[PDB]
Design a protein around this motif. Structure first.
Motif, mmCIF file in Angstrom:
data_model
loop_
_atom_site.group_PDB
_atom_site.id
_atom_site.type_symbol
_atom_site.label_atom_id
_atom_site.label_comp_id
_atom_site.label_asym_id
_atom_site.label_seq_id
_atom_site.Cartn_x
_atom_site.Cartn_y
_atom_site.Cartn_z
ATOM 1 N N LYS A 29 1.051 -1.330 -0.600
ATOM 2 C CA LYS A 29 -0.281 0.070 -0.173
ATOM 3 C C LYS A 29 1.083 0.891 -0.036
ATOM 4 C CE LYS A 29 -4.346 -1.680 0.257
ATOM 5 N NZ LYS A 29 -3.779 -3.408 -0.233
ATOM 6 N N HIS A 60 -4.011 3.711 5.984
ATOM 7 C CA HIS A 60 -4.575 2.203 5.887
ATOM 8 C C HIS A 60 -4.898 1.472 7.107
ATOM 9 C CE1 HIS A 60 -1.925 3.138 2.519
ATOM 10 N NE2 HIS A 60 -1.315 3.972 3.163
ATOM 11 N N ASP A 100 -6.531 -2.023 6.579
ATOM 12 C CA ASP A 100 -5.430 -2.672 6.427
ATOM 13 C C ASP A 100 -4.309 -2.936 7.681
ATOM 14 O OD1 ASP A 100 -6.314 -2.476 3.593
ATOM 15 O OD2 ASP A 100 -5.967 -4.179 3.790
#
Ligand code: HEM
Ligand SMILES: [Mn+2]
Length: 153
Positions: free
Chosen positions: A16, A119, A122
């Motif tokens: 990411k 994020h 995640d």
């Protein structure tokens, strides 16, 4: 030592970061500089930037963040087998930039903060724990190389 599953979580969130390395590097530096202004001092090329917007507009700071995060990503991808990648980094940071281990703790905190800010879906508790362990391993191994070169972290 990290488990295979812990490494997988580290590399999952790292992919990411790789969707926008420059932006992540900017946010990490800005957080680091704000939380710990003495680290802005160590960056004697950027010590002079006064505001967040000046920091974001600095192309040189943005390029430096990409160089930094690219080296970290290369290390993380070796899943602990990083002697060849870590040694030159330890050499420059011990003998030229003179970055104490405590400053690597500071940037580790900023990395965690930025990753959770960008994020959260995640980067829950287990992923944070895995990234914390990987950054702890990084700091432990670089401290040992620091000492091999003389002068302590
Ligand atoms: C995640 C940990 C870090 C990684 C992977 C990293 C990586 C790098 C790399 C790859 C360079 C360019 C080549 C070199 O000189 O080694 C660099 C330069 C530098 N880094 Fe680091 N770095 C880290 C943390 C820090 C921290 C915490 C500081 C200071 C608080 C710092 C300060 C600097 C400075 C001052 C330079 C050179 C800047 C210049 O040319 O003006 N780095 N870093
Ligand atoms: Mn930096």
């Amino acid at each position: 030592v990290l488990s295979e599953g812990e490494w997988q979580l580290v590399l999952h969130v790292w992919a990411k970061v790789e969707a926008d390395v420059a932006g992540h590097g900017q946010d990490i530096h800005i957080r680091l500089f704000k939380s710990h202004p003495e680290t802005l001092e160590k960056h004697d090329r950027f010590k002079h930037l006064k505001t967040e917007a000046e920091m974001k507009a600095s192309e040189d700071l943005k390029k430096h963040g990409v160089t930094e995060l690219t080296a970290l990503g290369a290390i993380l991808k070796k899943k602990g087998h990083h002697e060849a990648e870590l040694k030159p980094l330890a050499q420059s940071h011990a003998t030229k930039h003179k970055i104490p281990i405590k400053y690597l703790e500071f940037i580790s905190e900023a990395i965690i903060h930025v990753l959770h800010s960008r994020h959260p879906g995640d980067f829950g508790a287990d992923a944070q724990g895995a990234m914390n362990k990987a950054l702890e391993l990084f700091r432990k191994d670089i401290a040992a190389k620091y000492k091999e070169l003389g002068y302590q972290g």
